[PDB]
């Protein structure tokens, strides 16, 4: 009957919701990694100063 179609659309959209959250969460993990890369440059600059000392 039509009940299966009603549930399938909600189930299909729910799966996309989890994928959207997972992709956004993955981007958050990537953003932290990218931010740490900028911090690593400061550590690299500090290391060069330590080498100069």
């Amino acid at each position: 009957n039509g009940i299966a179609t009603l549930l399938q659309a909600e189930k299909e959209a729910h799966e996309i919701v989890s994928k959207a959250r997972k992709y956004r969460q993955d981007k958050l993990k990537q953003a932290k990694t990218d931010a740490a890369k900028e911090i690593d440059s400061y550590k690299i600059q500090k290391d060069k100063e330590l080498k100069e000392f």
Partner: protein, 191 residues
């Protein structure tokens, strides 16, 4: 006397346990009494390669010690008074002992678990413990979380079956995929 005169001179002590040996828990290293005085020296190498290795090592030693003390208490006072965090510590350390510390030599997969696979498995175990504790702190009950994340727990325990002969790049990729699956499973369970 030979053991004492050897401990007085050797810098490492891989004390074996007969009780763990009987259960085929191998190599049966008694983590309570064993020590290595070279951990401080090896910081200069673990910083160059595998920077998080010492942090993971102290974290797993903390987990094992805490769960050893807790199991000692439970053996005489029952598991009724344990909190959810303590139960997670017990389960995580049992998983560590039965799937990471135990290394079945004379087997194809775990004859030689090299440093990179050891570090990745160590990261997987520590991340499982940390994320389980975060999930229980978020309000999720541990009894339900165990059934919800049995798949993640078995994937972690089965990570030792990744044959190191597949190459450092391949096994590292499999461990990254396993960590992603673990994070997704906990996110779905705690949602």
């Amino acid at each position: 006397p030979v053991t004492t005169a050897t401990l007085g001179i050797t810098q490492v002590f891989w004390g074996l346990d007969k009780k763990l040996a009987q259960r085929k828990h191998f190599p049966s290293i008694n983590t309570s009494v064993s020590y290595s005085k070279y951990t401080n020296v090896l910081n200069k190498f673990y910083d160059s390669n595998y920077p998080e290795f010492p942090v993971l090592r102290d974290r797993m030693k903390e987990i094992l010690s805490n769960a050893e003390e807790l199991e000692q208490v439970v053996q005489l006072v029952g598991k009724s008074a344990l909190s959810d965090s303590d139960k997670i510590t017990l389960d995580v350390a049992t998983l560590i002992k039965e799937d990471f510390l135990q290394q079945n030599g004379y087997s194809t997969y775990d004859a030689f678990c090299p440093i990179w696979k050891t570090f990745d498995m160590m990261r997987a175990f520590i991340s499982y413990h940390d994320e389980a504790q975060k999930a229980v702190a978020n309000g999720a009950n541990w009894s339900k979380l165990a059934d919800s994340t049995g798949d993640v727990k078995h994937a972690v325990s089965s990570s030792k079956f990744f044959e190191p002969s597949r190459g450092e790049k391949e096994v590292h990729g499999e461990f990254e995929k396993l960590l992603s699956t673990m994070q997704e499973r906990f996110a779905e369970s705690t949602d």
